[PDB]
Amino acid sequence: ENTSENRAQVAARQHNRKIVEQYMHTRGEARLKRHLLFTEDGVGGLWTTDSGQPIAIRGREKLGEHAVWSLQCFPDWVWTDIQIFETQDPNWFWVECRGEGAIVFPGYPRGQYRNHFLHSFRFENGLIKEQREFMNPCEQFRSLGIEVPEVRRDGLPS
């Protein structure tokens, strides 16, 4: 149906998609202003940690501060193989991608970090209300030199 309501959905989804595109392509010193893509009360961060709790960063200004820390610890980070998934909610997207770059955490030797990521992006009046990142924390351990725990899986078919 070509109705004004349907057209409103399409328009919302198209604008929001451009914002997801911009986020995923933000690199270098532009990472210091990525927080401007969020609502004032917007939340961002890592949902897959070794603690099992999320590292959630609440609010535009707090997001800006993390950006400084991010840029120092992942100095040359790039996202690649970016695939964007629109959903039946014009305000909710998923992204599947890669990421790679040097990792520089105090306490560990400088390393090369690669991982596989899923990102969730929820929108409200055209800005990001909630971003969440899902990766394999084991691949981060490897990059930092931290021995990875191994699970034996006996009897698993082959």
Place this chain on the structure above:
Amino acid sequence: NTSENRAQVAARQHNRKIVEQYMHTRGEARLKRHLLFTEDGVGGLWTTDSGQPIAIRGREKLGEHAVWSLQCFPDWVWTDIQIFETQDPNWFWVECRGEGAIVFPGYPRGQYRNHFLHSFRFENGLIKEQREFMNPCEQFRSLGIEVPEVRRDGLPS
């Protein structure tokens, strides 16, 4: 309102009920979930401690792995299930929780819970590729395996 788009919309709806069936499969019904796949279908775990997938290739082999899964995870349930349709009528994502007893050889019995993202891609209305993404640290915990802590020194507050 073309017949192509009517095709897509049908395909998408058909596929969605297969995703729903998969997510609601519990108990002894787990022994026939492999029936929802193409004969060449792949399923498995994409977030492992090795950094490579434990993929199970083929409808036959999937059926055989269900016997092992039913022994390892005897009372497993998915909950808080949110299905996401996409622009591709043959690609769905699901966010959910999962929990149950975990009963692996050589580890003490535990209670395992995790947050999951699932990817389902379809072909001729069956599942051609299923992939599961979770946090392996929570499986370590359930098995009594020590999980190391990453220190994040300058991380602000």
